[PDB]
Ligand binder design. Structure first.
Ligand SMILES: [Cl-]
Length: 691
């Protein structure tokens, strides 16, 4: 087809010129080839790549956005590294700095005084104003946004604004005469530093800058404690907490490619080489990162020092992050659409059986709950990081991952405090207590014990789940030191594993044989119920489930014909000490305690989200007005759709509102250790966006 050439896209003749000098110097080293094509602008180049006339182009965050849309749908494949090696920066945070001691929170900037870096800049305007669109009263595109922010702050310094159309935006500007409010250095309250000094001097109440500013311009480490940042969950925290209190992380420029047949391989080969040899301080004959005397950042930024391969799970939407992604969409969207969308709760359903239930739920929510879906739990997480979905209930194993991703716990799934017991009218404030992970076996083989389970057949709820995987595989690991999970057992049914492995050997997919090993309801051997079924159907010898699982699938508690005649007495539990115990004794024969499933979300959605659930609960929870009349939120019965079936109510966290706190330190430490052997596409992705 098309030569082992990567075809680079240029936006200027100058750029085209550097390209050609690239092409020739790559030929001279018998390095990977690069062709060059020239267009007049970034979109022309986005168009080119998408119509197959070019392969890559490096873009800034606003173009990464445009490029990810239809009809282009390109993707970031390599990121520019700035700084110095050892001081490598892949991004910065867009923060709202205010001085110590106020009671105003982001929700309340109304009527205050603002200091911005400059009209249409990322951190001084796009992010902040996009973030605040909800409050502006601003009809929309067009009426000029400027008209509404001028009506929201009582005064700002917005360099570059029209002091003739919006005098207010320039009133705190410190420039003399006509310089006043200039998008230049002639204006002292211009860019990061002018905007911060604007605060510093007492002219404005809030400065919208980048995190580094605060650091690089504050001398001691003492008048730095005189400062504070505003968080999107309407809190305030100190300036070194920017990794947890920021309006947006703005990513470094990235080399974008086609999401389908993008030559990403080719592209990274080219780049890695381009870099070893024509790097920074690498050769006098050519410099990838360098521009000819009256030119700036041709092809790459002249300040870049290298590139970072962006994990394949990243999207333009994941690349920008929710803060930045939603800021850009808000500034485009009608006011009614913004309205609607902050009111609605978009649930993320994993699988079609879960979407059926959601839909049903959505129907009766009196408009407050809507549904989105994905095929996997990581995919739902990624839809909430993109702001496309808002919540879902997750196992603690995925609470860690969504937490590494910046998501937070909101409410926990409360279970009844022990095997047989009564309803607590105060379920919502009762502290969560966890649940027990067990290893259940069929009573027939007498010789099977915890000490001989190695080498047999296992049934797991899914990979990365607590009772189904982390605990059993963590235990075994402790014992053997081996990271070779697929050699612990002969054959297994472990949804979410490699379809070609022994780990997926016992899965049976759906009625037709498809969806084998997918980690959703379509796999009949998926979850608590499916891993139990895997044991009961004698596909595997041990099932890693919770103690309640046996109870809900035996003695007729489960209707399904495979389950119908099962008897509790037909199962035993494998205790850590080698004994076998009846199922009613999980209290003294369990593998470990696992944290309750938790509803997670984005900080920007937490108060709206509790409010809709508390309220949805009241109508459809365990003792609720319309349950079972119309719909029961916590019933599917042995189905476990959206929520576990033994959920009494959704309950408060008791300040345990960070994945770290909610799971607690021994849980964290254990999983951390395990992720060493292997990770996941999304943990990977999130580790990269946070590095
Ligand atoms: Cl599980």
């Amino acid at each position: 087809g098309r030569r082992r050439s990567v075809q680079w896209c240029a936006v200027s003749n100058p750029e085209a010129t550097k390209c050609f000098q690239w092409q020739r110097n790559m030929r001279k080293v018998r390095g990977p080839p690069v062709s060059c094509i020239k267009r007049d602008s970034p979109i022309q180049c986005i168009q080119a790549i998408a119509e197959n006339r070019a392969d890559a182009v490096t873009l800034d965050g606003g173009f990464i956005y445009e490029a990810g849309l239809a009809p282009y749908k390109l993707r970031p494949v390599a990121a520019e590294v700035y700084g110095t090696e050892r001081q490598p920066r892949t991004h910065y945070y867009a923060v709202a700095v205010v001085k110590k001691g106020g009671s105003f929170q982001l929700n309340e900037l109304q009527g205050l005084k603002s200091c911005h870096t400059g009209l249409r800049r990322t951190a001084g305007w796009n992010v902040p104003i996009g973030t605040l669109r909800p409050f502006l009263n601003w009809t929309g595109p067009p009426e000029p946004i400027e008209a509404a922010v001028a009506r929201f702050f009582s005064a700002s310094c917005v360099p570059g604004a029209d002091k003739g159309q919006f005098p207010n935006l320039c009133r705190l500007c410190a420039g003399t005469g006509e310089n006043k409010c200039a998008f230049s250095s002639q204006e002292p309250y211009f860019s990061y530093s002018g905007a911060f000094k604007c605060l510093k001097d007492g002219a404005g109440d809030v400065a919208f800058i980048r995190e580094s500013t605060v650091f690089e311009d504050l001398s001691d480490e003492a008048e730095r404690d005189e400062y504070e940042l505003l968080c999107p969950d309407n809190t305030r925290k100190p300036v070194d907490k920017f990794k947890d209190c920021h309006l947006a992380r703005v990513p470094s420029h990235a080399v974008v490619a086609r999401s389908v047949n993008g030559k990403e391989d080719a592209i990274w080969n080219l780049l890695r080489q381009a870099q070893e040899k024509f790097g920074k301080d690498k050769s006098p004959k050519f410099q990838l990162f360098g521009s000819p005397s009256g030119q700036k950042d041709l092809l790459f930024k002249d300040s870049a020092i290298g590139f970072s391969r962006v994990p394949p799970r990243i999207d333009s939407g994941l690349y920008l992050g929710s803060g930045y992604f939603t800021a850009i969409q808000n500034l485009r969207k009608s006011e009614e659409e913004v309205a609607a969308r902050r009111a609605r709760v978009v649930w993320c359903a994993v699988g079609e059986q879960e979407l059926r239930k959601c839909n049903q739920w959505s129907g009766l929510s009196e408009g407050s709950v809507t549904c989105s879906s994905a095929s996997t739990t990581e995919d739902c997480i990624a839809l909430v990081l993109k702001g496309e979905a808002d919540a879902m209930s997750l196992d603690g194993g995925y609470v860690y991952t969504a937490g590494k991703c910046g998501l937070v716990p909101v409410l926990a799934e409360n279970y009844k405090s022990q095997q047989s017991s009564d309803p607590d009218p105060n379920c919502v404030d009762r502290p969560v207590e966890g649940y027990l992970a067990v290893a259940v076996v069929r009573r027939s083989d007498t010789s099977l014990t915890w000490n001989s389970v190695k080498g047999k057949k296992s049934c797991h709820t899914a990979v990365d789940r607590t009772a189904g995987w982390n605990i059993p595989m963590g235990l075994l690991f402790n014992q053997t030191g081996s990271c070779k999970f697929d050699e612990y057992f002969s054959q297994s049914c472990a949804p979410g594993s490699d379809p070609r492995s022994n780990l997926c050997a016992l899965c049976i997919g759906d009625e037709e044989g498809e969806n084998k090993c997918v980690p959703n309801s379509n796999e009949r051997y998926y979850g608590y119920t499916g891993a139990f079924r895997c044991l009961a159907e004698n596909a595997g010898d041990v099932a890693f489930v919770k103690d309640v699982t046996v109870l809900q699938n035996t003695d007729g508690n489960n209707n399904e014909a495979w389950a119908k005649d099962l008897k509790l007495a037909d199962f035993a539990l494998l205790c850590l000490d080698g004994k076998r115990k009846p199922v009613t004794e999980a209290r003294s024969c369990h593998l470990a305690m696992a944290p309750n499933h938790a509803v997670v979300s984005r900080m920007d959605k937490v108060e709206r989200l509790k409010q809709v659930l508390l309220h949805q609960q009241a109508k459809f929870g365990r003792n609720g007005s319309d349950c079972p009349d119309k719909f029961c939120l916590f019933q599917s019965e042995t189905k476990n759709l959206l929520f576990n079936d033994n959920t009494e109510c959704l309950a408060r966290l008791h300040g345990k509102t960070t994945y770290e706190k909610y799971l607690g330190p021994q849980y964290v430490a254990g999983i951390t250790n395990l992720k060493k052997c292997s990770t996941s596409p999304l943990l990977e992705a999130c580790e990269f966006l946070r590095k």
